Design a protein around this ligand. Structure first.
Ligand code: MG
Ligand code: MG
Ligand code: MG
Ligand code: MG
Ligand code: MG
Ligand code: MG
Ligand code: MG
Ligand code: MG
Ligand code: MG
Ligand code: MG
Ligand code: MG
Ligand code: MG
Ligand code: MG
Ligand code: MG
Ligand code: MG
Ligand code: MG
Ligand code: MG
Ligand code: MG
Ligand code: MG
Ligand code: MG
Ligand code: MG
Ligand code: MG
Ligand code: MG
Ligand code: MG
Ligand code: MG
Ligand code: MG
Ligand code: MG
Ligand code: MG
Ligand code: MG
Ligand code: MG
Ligand code: MG
Ligand code: MG
Ligand code: MG
Ligand code: MG
Ligand code: MG
Ligand code: MG
Ligand code: MG
Ligand code: MG
Ligand code: MG
Ligand code: MG
Ligand code: MG
Ligand code: MG
Ligand code: MG
Ligand code: MG
Ligand code: MG
Ligand code: MG
Ligand code: MG
Ligand code: MG
Ligand code: MG
Ligand code: MG
Ligand code: MG
Ligand code: MG
Ligand code: MG
Ligand code: MG
Ligand code: MG
Ligand code: MG
Ligand code: MG
Ligand code: MG
Ligand code: MG
Ligand code: MG
Ligand code: MG
Ligand code: MG
Ligand code: MG
Ligand code: MG
Ligand code: MG
Ligand code: MG
Ligand code: MG
Ligand code: MG
Ligand code: MG
Ligand code: MG
Ligand code: MG
Ligand code: MG
Ligand code: MG
Ligand code: MG
Ligand code: MG
Ligand code: MG
Ligand code: MG
Ligand code: MG
Ligand code: MG
Ligand code: MG
Ligand code: MG
Ligand code: MG
Ligand code: MG
Ligand code: MG
Ligand code: MG
Ligand code: MG
Ligand code: MG
Ligand code: MG
Ligand code: MG
Ligand code: MG
Ligand code: MG
Ligand code: MG
Ligand code: MG
Ligand code: MG
Ligand code: MG
Ligand code: MG
Ligand code: MG
Ligand code: MG
Ligand code: MG
Ligand code: MG
Ligand code: MG
Ligand code: MG
Ligand code: MG
Ligand code: MG
Ligand code: MG
Ligand code: MG
Ligand code: MG
Ligand code: MG
Ligand code: MG
Ligand code: MG
Ligand code: MG
Ligand code: MG
Ligand code: MG
Ligand code: MG
Ligand code: MG
Ligand code: MG
Ligand code: MG
Ligand code: MG
Ligand code: MG
Ligand code: MG
Ligand code: MG
Ligand code: MG
Ligand code: MG
Ligand code: MG
Ligand code: MG
Ligand code: MG
Ligand code: MG
Ligand code: MG
Ligand code: MG
Ligand code: MG
Ligand code: MG
Ligand code: MG
Ligand code: MG
Ligand code: MG
Ligand code: MG
Ligand code: MG
Ligand code: MG
Ligand code: MG
Ligand code: MG
Ligand code: MG
Ligand code: MG
Ligand code: MG
Ligand code: MG
Ligand code: MG
Ligand code: MG
Ligand code: MG
Ligand code: MG
Ligand code: MG
Ligand code: MG
Ligand code: MG
Ligand code: MG
Ligand code: MG
Ligand code: MG
Ligand code: MG
Ligand code: MG
Ligand code: MG
Ligand code: MG
Ligand code: MG
Ligand code: MG
Ligand code: MG
Ligand code: MG
Ligand code: MG
Ligand code: MG
Ligand code: MG
Ligand code: MG
Ligand code: MG
Ligand code: MG
Ligand code: MG
Ligand code: MG
Ligand code: MG
Ligand code: MG
Ligand code: MG
Ligand code: MG
Ligand code: MG
Ligand code: MG
Ligand code: MG
Ligand code: MG
Ligand code: MG
Lengths: 141, 76, 59, 69, 186, 110
RNA sequence: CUGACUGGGGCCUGUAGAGCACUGAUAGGGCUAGGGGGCCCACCAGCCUACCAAACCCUGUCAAACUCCGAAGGGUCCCAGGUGGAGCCUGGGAGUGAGGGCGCGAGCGAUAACGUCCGCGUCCGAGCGCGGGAACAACCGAGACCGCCAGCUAAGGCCCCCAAGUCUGGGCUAAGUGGUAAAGGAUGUGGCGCCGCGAAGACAGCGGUCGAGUGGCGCCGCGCCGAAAAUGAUCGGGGCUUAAGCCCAGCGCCGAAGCUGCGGGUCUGGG
RNA sequence: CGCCUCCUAAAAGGUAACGGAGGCGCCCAAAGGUCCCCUCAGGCGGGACGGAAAUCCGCCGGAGAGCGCAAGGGUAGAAGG
RNA sequence: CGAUCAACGGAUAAAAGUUACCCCGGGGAUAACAGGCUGAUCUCCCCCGAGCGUCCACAGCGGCGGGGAGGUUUGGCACCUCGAUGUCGGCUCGUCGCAUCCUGGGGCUGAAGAAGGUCCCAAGGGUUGGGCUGUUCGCCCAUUAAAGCGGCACGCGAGCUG
RNA sequence: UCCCCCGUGCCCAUAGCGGCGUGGAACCACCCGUUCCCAUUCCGAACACGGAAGUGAAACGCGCCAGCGCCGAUGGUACUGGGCGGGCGACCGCCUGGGAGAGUAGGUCGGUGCGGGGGA
């Protein structure tokens, strides 16, 4: 419910998550944001569960920006098969998120509403998160 | 259940004598696919693009920028 | 000058090249002290094994 | 989960015991299999109640007395 | 206001060290000048949050010398989200490219319809002389409606203060709201 | 972008400098026709001759065989020997060819 | 004298990182082909769209099989140092061609396995010989020719079991935390920051009287819950609370088959 | 199950798995040697049939075309016509 | 010049099956049992609070998602055991866990009473007799305070059955 | 030695693109012709030959402008050879040596070798 509509390649290898985020570290759209404290794969079905929850908190709202998108294919061998005989099948897609990246922002809504919407949204994510405001530093990047 | 699994014998390409090295007429100095180095002074290219010393001397590499890189053998 | 290089910590479990350095220096036993010309080459090997050595300047 | 044709059935009120394998095949059938499924769907939970009632009074194997499916 | 900040020349000092002490290290420079400095962190900060890259900061150096400056870039640390290091640009008399804030005056009829105002620039790039640094530049967003937009071609301006950017650039928009009835569909 | 002229130029001069003789290079203008022996390893022109310079004459072509014979005479004296005929971007023809044949008579080797 | 290893010097290279100029991916906005829909209208075009949306632009991003860019390192050649159970050359004799753990870089797997498969490295293998780690092939220390009722160290230790400090100064912790775990939750407790409302006397109590401070956030430390498994318990044990715990900073000691002292043996080179 | 290309492969070379992706078992008497000439895709405007695209004209256009075939490397200062 | 000698360094010019009638040499270098490592799968428990519950998020519930525990399921691995670690189920005999079926004590209740629901504390004791099937399991009869779930080599064949 | 122009190289966009602006004495082009040499899958467009009315329109040479393009520090960071600590992990740090990329300041409308014709 977020995936590339086309890929050059169908499955791809796993890689590591060293370091903090290539960038994506400063706010840049809305007023408030959710930043990642820990590295993780974030599954589209999570990213969407997180989105949806806020939109529902707004009930008819401001804007919800989504700044990470799941372009990495997630593979799994079916159950009970042994080792080998190829690489499994793509069961999902994830977004790779190293620490300090801003995953979601909101605008168009009161400070008390972002503090919530971003908080509840946080819980659907599988990692630690900070809520943030626009700074001057985000404005100067 | 794999359509994959092939790959081909590896080709050992690249420069075989570096700048400053002493060669002998006939030495292969570069193994390449197409022209990553043009032959410069005293260096010929063979039907596969391999470059080789035409005379005994010393290799020198030259980077002509837009014109590409060249391998020369400065005779001794 | 000269360097006086004493081997204070065992190379066992360290890489072969650092073992080799220790040899180019000529230090074969723990605690052994060697008195060594201070050239750049000698200093290089003295620095390579620096975590196994105690150095001080001399003559 | 559990993917019945129109509504629901929800998200885990169903009971699947893995019991041992009857008949052919050795110690593995005697032992690691298992690999066999009894299930319990106790007829009053979830469901449209039109399925529940058309399900409850029907005479069928696979559908118990108190049944329970 | 005219914002003033102390500051001090550093040489060998490791920024790790400074940073540890509460001192955000930085450089200052322009065509005639380049010097390694630091400011105090918590002090620098006092200023910057009100100041930013919009208003002139005046560095007071120990030699007594006091130079007027604009902040060029703050290099952030991605992990902490804390300023790592600051570029101080010494203004002189010339004109200079820079970023001037926007007041978006008035309540769009795009909002009040239930919409939301996306400020796509909180500020604008501008060539201008340091005598001319406008405290801001206002925009009427009132006549803006859901779907509508504002391009900086239609930005007001003082004298002068020539724009530096394609007037085809887009400074504001009014987008429709997040909505729950949207959910079932999607 | 390059012009057919600029390429044909390169295309011939390239092949020429590949064989590494002395370069006899020939410019031919609407009025005049000029020639130089060049060593492009040292980046230097050795021996020079022209119509405009030898102030003559002339029938455009017949002028050439002269400025050809001209160059050899001088050239040969300074020790060349042999050399490679750069035809520039010009069909080997006369005036261009009529040089050449000019140089060749005077003893230039090619 | 060439060797590993090192110094300087030249060339080779496309990884880490980063980037988006190429290939693709890609959120939002702009601009704008083409669809879709509403309005007219069949006189054949014209308008509006909070619909779908190509190209392009701006902001913001992603990539093993993308790279405008790119290290640290690595490889090679020269000159130098390097006399080493180095090196090259010709021969004789082998054994091995089931490896294993740990580290780091990846693939596969489920960012599982005392999992598999490669790369660099190490140890075990063959160092189940010695000290530490309660015990324990490969973690820490160290390469055991022999003898000594001698000395100094290593890791680890110095309350007793058990050699050496119930050693000195500062701080935290009240859980026996230490002495096995996560999201999460909390007036546990301590240290630096930020503002608010306060004699314009809310700050709690039942715009009045009380007479002093209160209330909401930040960065950090240590603790609490969250915490259920099957013969009898337990941090190795006893036992420990301004510590025998944790953080910081010293001094001394103890501690191997390491190193020293003394004696001896054999190989080797040299007198 | 042999051969080729790319990745994995840790910036020399080499490097494994029933790891990720594709090709070959032909062909060309011109698709060969040499001499000589010439330069692409694409975009916008123009033009009987003539259209998104036949052929023609202009302007813009470094190479995104082409190079029998897979990929890669090379390449118009030609290896392309 | 004659090779899909393509199993492509190509055993012969010339070649397919079955063995539960089977045998020998070997291997725990390698499967089936059991254990071990793992915990995807399974069982349990929590986070969040959309949303049900006339009204009311939280009596009872818990969309989309998130964190864990256990080591009972099926698996993954192939580490001791192939110069033997007898395999299901019954019987007999137990013993342990607590994630409690009953009995004891409690909080909340959408708890009038009586009965229930849900959670907490608690393992001392208890936890029936039959019909069907080799069964474990399950279905059913009649009861019951209740007819608990697991561990012990899915406890127990030098204790029996078979 | 200096200015100009014509030939050739070297650097390899700081040299490009796009605006203006200048030069014809000389040189170069365009230009006049198509008999002759030589040519067009047709075309004297190009190649080519014989010229010398004209013109610097085109092209070329030399200048100015920073709109694009190209270049680009200092500082800081990322990453890291080597040496060390932390965590059950994914991963997190320290020391020493090396150290980017992007971004900022800024830079740029070329520099130069040899030879020729002219000029001072
Ligand atoms: Mg996952
Ligand atoms: Mg998934
Ligand atoms: Mg969370
Ligand atoms: Mg900005
Ligand atoms: Mg950016
Ligand atoms: Mg195939
Ligand atoms: Mg392979
Ligand atoms: Mg290969
Ligand atoms: Mg290979
Ligand atoms: Mg060679
Ligand atoms: Mg050849
Ligand atoms: Mg050089
Ligand atoms: Mg060690
Ligand atoms: Mg080490
Ligand atoms: Mg080395
Ligand atoms: Mg040395
Ligand atoms: Mg559910
Ligand atoms: Mg049967
Ligand atoms: Mg049978
Ligand atoms: Mg059978
Ligand atoms: Mg701060
Ligand atoms: Mg829209
Ligand atoms: Mg030597
Ligand atoms: Mg050597
Ligand atoms: Mg060296
Ligand atoms: Mg490159
Ligand atoms: Mg990377
Ligand atoms: Mg791109
Ligand atoms: Mg950009
Ligand atoms: Mg593309
Ligand atoms: Mg778009
Ligand atoms: Mg790659
Ligand atoms: Mg890699
Ligand atoms: Mg890459
Ligand atoms: Mg660069
Ligand atoms: Mg380098
Ligand atoms: Mg060699
Ligand atoms: Mg080197
Ligand atoms: Mg030597
Ligand atoms: Mg031999
Ligand atoms: Mg031998
Ligand atoms: Mg023998
Ligand atoms: Mg043998
Ligand atoms: Mg191996
Ligand atoms: Mg080995
Ligand atoms: Mg190993
Ligand atoms: Mg480590
Ligand atoms: Mg893993
Ligand atoms: Mg492992
Ligand atoms: Mg293993
Ligand atoms: Mg062995
Ligand atoms: Mg040992
Ligand atoms: Mg050894
Ligand atoms: Mg033992
Ligand atoms: Mg021990
Ligand atoms: Mg030991
Ligand atoms: Mg072990
Ligand atoms: Mg020994
Ligand atoms: Mg002592
Ligand atoms: Mg110690
Ligand atoms: Mg102590
Ligand atoms: Mg004692
Ligand atoms: Mg004391
Ligand atoms: Mg104390
Ligand atoms: Mg407790
Ligand atoms: Mg305890
Ligand atoms: Mg405890
Ligand atoms: Mg916690
Ligand atoms: Mg928390
Ligand atoms: Mg406190
Ligand atoms: Mg606290
Ligand atoms: Mg304070
Ligand atoms: Mg008060
Ligand atoms: Mg606890
Ligand atoms: Mg309990
Ligand atoms: Mg201490
Ligand atoms: Mg000894
Ligand atoms: Mg002795
Ligand atoms: Mg010996
Ligand atoms: Mg002798
Ligand atoms: Mg390689
Ligand atoms: Mg490598
Ligand atoms: Mg061909
Ligand atoms: Mg075209
Ligand atoms: Mg057209
Ligand atoms: Mg028309
Ligand atoms: Mg038409
Ligand atoms: Mg057409
Ligand atoms: Mg055309
Ligand atoms: Mg191409
Ligand atoms: Mg490539
Ligand atoms: Mg051709
Ligand atoms: Mg044959
Ligand atoms: Mg065959
Ligand atoms: Mg095949
Ligand atoms: Mg074979
Ligand atoms: Mg065969
Ligand atoms: Mg074979
Ligand atoms: Mg072979
Ligand atoms: Mg045969
Ligand atoms: Mg048979
Ligand atoms: Mg048999
Ligand atoms: Mg039979
Ligand atoms: Mg059989
Ligand atoms: Mg028989
Ligand atoms: Mg028989
Ligand atoms: Mg047998
Ligand atoms: Mg085997
Ligand atoms: Mg068993
Ligand atoms: Mg098993
Ligand atoms: Mg066993
Ligand atoms: Mg577990
Ligand atoms: Mg829990
Ligand atoms: Mg209620
Ligand atoms: Mg309701
Ligand atoms: Mg759930
Ligand atoms: Mg989980
Ligand atoms: Mg789970
Ligand atoms: Mg678990
Ligand atoms: Mg078990
Ligand atoms: Mg198992
Ligand atoms: Mg085994
Ligand atoms: Mg194995
Ligand atoms: Mg066995
Ligand atoms: Mg036995
Ligand atoms: Mg036995
Ligand atoms: Mg038996
Ligand atoms: Mg029975
Ligand atoms: Mg309990
Ligand atoms: Mg429960
Ligand atoms: Mg009770
Ligand atoms: Mg009572
Ligand atoms: Mg109750
Ligand atoms: Mg009520
Ligand atoms: Mg009652
Ligand atoms: Mg009990
Ligand atoms: Mg009991
Ligand atoms: Mg009981
Ligand atoms: Mg019963
Ligand atoms: Mg019974
Ligand atoms: Mg009967
Ligand atoms: Mg029966
Ligand atoms: Mg059954
Ligand atoms: Mg029962
Ligand atoms: Mg039992
Ligand atoms: Mg079992
Ligand atoms: Mg049993
Ligand atoms: Mg049982
Ligand atoms: Mg039995
Ligand atoms: Mg027995
Ligand atoms: Mg019988
Ligand atoms: Mg030159
Ligand atoms: Mg460039
Ligand atoms: Mg030039
Ligand atoms: Mg003019
Ligand atoms: Mg004139
Ligand atoms: Mg005139
Ligand atoms: Mg022309
Ligand atoms: Mg002009
Ligand atoms: Mg010209
Ligand atoms: Mg510019
Ligand atoms: Mg730059
Ligand atoms: Mg630096
Ligand atoms: Mg490092
Ligand atoms: Mg590091
Ligand atoms: Mg290294
Ligand atoms: Mg390292
Ligand atoms: Mg650990
Ligand atoms: Mg680090
Ligand atoms: Mg460093
Ligand atoms: Mg440094
Ligand atoms: Mg730097
Ligand atoms: Mg840079
Ligand atoms: Mg600039
Ligand atoms: Mg300029
Ligand atoms: Mg320029
Ligand atoms: Mg020039
Ligand atoms: Mg003159």
């Amino acid at each position: 419910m977020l995936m590339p509509r086309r890929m050059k390649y169908r499955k791809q290898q796993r890689g590591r998550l060293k370091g903090a985020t290539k960038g994506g570290d400063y706010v840049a759209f809305g007023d408030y944001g959710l930043v990642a404290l820990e590295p993780a794969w974030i599954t589209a079905q999570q990213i969407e569960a997180a989105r949806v929850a806020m939109v529902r908190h707004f009930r008819r709202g401001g804007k919800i920006f989504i700044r990470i998108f799941p372009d990495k294919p997630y593979t799994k061998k079916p159950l009970e098969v042994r080792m080998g005989k190829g690489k499994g099948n793509v069961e999902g897609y994830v977004a790779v998120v190293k620490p300090g990246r801003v995953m979601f922002e909101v605008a168009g809504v009161t400070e008390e509403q972002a503090m919530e919407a971003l908080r509840i949204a946080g819980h659907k994510l599988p990692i630690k998160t900070k809520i943030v405001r626009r700074d001057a530093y985000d404005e100067a990047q | 259940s794999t359509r994959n699994g092939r790959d081909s014998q590896a080709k050992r390409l690249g420069v075989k004598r570096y700048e400053g090295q002493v060669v002998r007429a006939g030495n292969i100095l570069v193994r390449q696919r197409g022209t990553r180095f043009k032959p410069g002074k005293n260096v010929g290219m063979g039907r596969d693009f391999t470059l080789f010393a035409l005379v005994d001397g010393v290799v020198e590499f030259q980077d002509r920028g837009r014109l590409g890189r060249y391998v020369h053998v400065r005779p001794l | 000058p000269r360097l006086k290089v004493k081997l204070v910590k065992s190379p066992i479990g360290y890489p072969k090249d650092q073992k080799a350095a220790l040899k180019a220096l000529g230090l074969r036993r723990l605690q052994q002290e060697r008195v060594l010309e201070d050239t750049p080459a000698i200093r290089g090997n003295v620095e390579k094994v620096a975590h196994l050595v105690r150095v001080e300047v001399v003559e | 989960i559990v993917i019945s044709r129109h509504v629901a059935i929800p998200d885990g009120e169903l009971e699947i015991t893995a019991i041992r394998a009857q008949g052919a095949g050795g110690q593995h059938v005697n032992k690691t299999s298992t690999a066999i499924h009894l299930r319990f769907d106790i007829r009053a939970s979830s469901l449209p109640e039109y399925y529940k009632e058309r399900l409850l009074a029907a005479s069928h194997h696979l559908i118990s007395s108190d049944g329970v499916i | 206001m005219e914002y003033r900040l102390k500051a001090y020349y550093r040489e060998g000092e490791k920024p790790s060290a400074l940073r540890r002490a509460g001192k955000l290290p930085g450089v200052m420079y322009n065509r005639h000048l380049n010097r390694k400095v630091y400011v105090d962190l918590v002090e620098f900060d006092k200023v910057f949050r009100q100041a930013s890259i919009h208003h002139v900061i005046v560095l007071e150096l120990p030699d007594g010398q006091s130079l007027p400056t604009l902040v060029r870039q703050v290099n952030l640390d991605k992990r902490r989200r804390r300023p790592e290091h600051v570029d101080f640009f010494v203004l002189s008399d010339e004109p200079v490219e820079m970023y001037v804030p926007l007041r978006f005056v008035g309540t769009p009829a795009g909002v009040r319809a239930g919409g939301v105002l996306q400020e796509i620039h909180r500020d604008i790039l501008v060539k201008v002389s340091p005598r001319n640094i406008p405290e801001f530049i206002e925009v009427d967003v009132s006549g803006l409606e859901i779907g509508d937009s504002l391009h900086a071609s239609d930005l007001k301006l003082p004298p002068g203060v020539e724009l530096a950017v394609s007037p085809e650039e887009t400074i504001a928009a009014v987008v429709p709201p997040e909505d729950v009835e949207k959910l079932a569909e999607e | 972008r390059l012009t057919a002229y600029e390429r044909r130029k390169f295309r011939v001069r390239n092949r020429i400098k590949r064989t590494g003789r002395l370069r006899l290079s020939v410019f031919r203008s609407l009025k005049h026709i000029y020639a130089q022996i060049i060593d492009d390893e040292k980046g230097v022109t050795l021996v020079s001759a022209s119509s405009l310079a030898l102030k003559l004459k002339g029938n455009k072509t017949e002028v050439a065989r002269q400025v050809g014979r001209a160059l050899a005479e001088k050239a040969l004296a300074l020790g060349i020997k042999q050399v490679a005929f750069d035809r520039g971007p010009y069909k080997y023809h006369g005036r261009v060819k009529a040089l050449a044949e000019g140089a060749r008579e005077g003893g230039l080797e090619f």
